[PDB]
């Protein structure tokens with residue numbers, strides 16, 4: 001057969017001289033795009049993403065490559081694995097992170113520390129970027145290492161700087177050009193060398209933690225993901241077919257930090273910029289916190305079901321946020337039939353999540369902040385099929401539950417204790433991203449946390 005429609009490519013440049021959502025109106029919801037010397041099928045709109053990821057879930061359950069980090073991951077780890085490797089790691093990961101209320105108690109604890117830290121500034125202007133990277137890194141440190149770090153620790157901070165520098169280098173023009181031609185640019189200096197060095201330095205720290213965990217291991221009292229994985233690693237020691245080896249341990253742990261920090265942190269950074277721009281919304285979240293939780297006890301995950309306005313605001317922050325606008329690349333596991341077109345085995349697929357989050361079928365005002373998008377006539381929370389910020393299908397975000405608990409407990413715990421102000425008036429606040437790509441990031445801003 002033939003691949004979906006699209007612009008006619010060129011020998012090596014592919015469709016370079018024709019550069020996803022731009023091409024949609026001419027070719028359609030599903031089209032073929034050549035990113036140099038490789039073809040990609042793009043899925044635009046809620047229904048075409050749902051058709052592929054939900055209706056043909058096993059076929060679209062493959063994972064593609066991100067050329068700038070593929071030299072680190074090399075198909076290992078829970079995010080970038082495929083086939084049996086992926087199934088075994090994902091199954092083990094859901095099971096272990098589910099075995100350790102404790103993720104909620106640790107998020108509550110991390111929110112109590114954040115309040116304590118914001119209270120020391122005493123209403124001073126600060127850039128919350130570093131503290132939001134720190135609380136989301138501390139939830140994973142707690143899960144994978146069985147402990148958290150102090151916000152003023154220089155070991156912790158040196159690893160964050162180096163790590164968050166990598167996300168900025170990944171979602172950049174330099175790295176975007178690398179994706180189009182990495183078989184040629186790998187031989188020259190570029191951001192790929194810095195991304196490589198920064199993630200190798202974090203892998204070295206993970207490797208040290210794993211040997212320290214093994215050296216202090218109590219097999220009858222596992223305390224975290226690494227301990228559990230080391231016990232599965234000694235169980236499967238005899239089987240050479242086992243996926244539970246050292247290379248998958250380091251790159252699974254890296255995968256959880258790579259995925260579990262940047263995006264949640266930015267969601268919180270973006271949310272506080274919207275709460276600065278729309279104080280009537282922040283005031284209303286505080287009114288709802290005051291009625292359900294009050295001012296003495298801290299927020300708990302059970303409070304969310306009784307706080308639909310706050311819950312709707314958080315949905316709208318993720319929707320308008322649109323942090324992963326093209327999704328994480330997929331691949332077809334076989335030669336698939338899709339809308340009359342034939343997608344050959346191993347072809348890369350891009351579920352353009354942004355086109356679902358801004359779909360005018362499901363959102364009255366797609367480009368405007370409207371918490372009413374998730375509230376019905378009775379003031380109750382309603383969800384629609386356009387809301388897919390964590391994607392869907394078999395590759396659906398493994399930390400969806402963690403991420404959603406973090407946003408609830410950090411937004412409400414901060415707002416119960418603090419009000420916010422900025423030198424920029426609400427009407428002059430801009431929400432333009434700082435660096436687009438695999439991970440959206442908004443512009444840096446200043447904010448005061450005023451104790452109540």
Ligand code: HEM
Pocket residue numbers: 063078079080090255256259260261263264267323324327328329351353389390391392394395396397398399400402403
């Ligand atoms: C607001 C925060 C977050 C957002 C918007 C988000 C979004 C996404 C998206 C769009 C994908 C791609 C799914 C696909 O390939 O179709 C994904 C995958 C993934 N997420 Fe997240 N995520 C968030 C937080 C987290 C957290 C906190 C964790 C870890 C605790 C995590 C772990 C993962 C993993 C391991 C994958 C790969 C799943 C697989 O390939 O099987 N994420 N996420």
Ligand SMILES: Clc1ccc(-c2cnc[nH]2)cc1
Pocket residue numbers: 066079258259260263328397438439
């Ligand atoms: Cl290349 C890439 C891979 C995974 C993520 C991710 C998963 N969940 C949150 N972030 C982001 C970017």
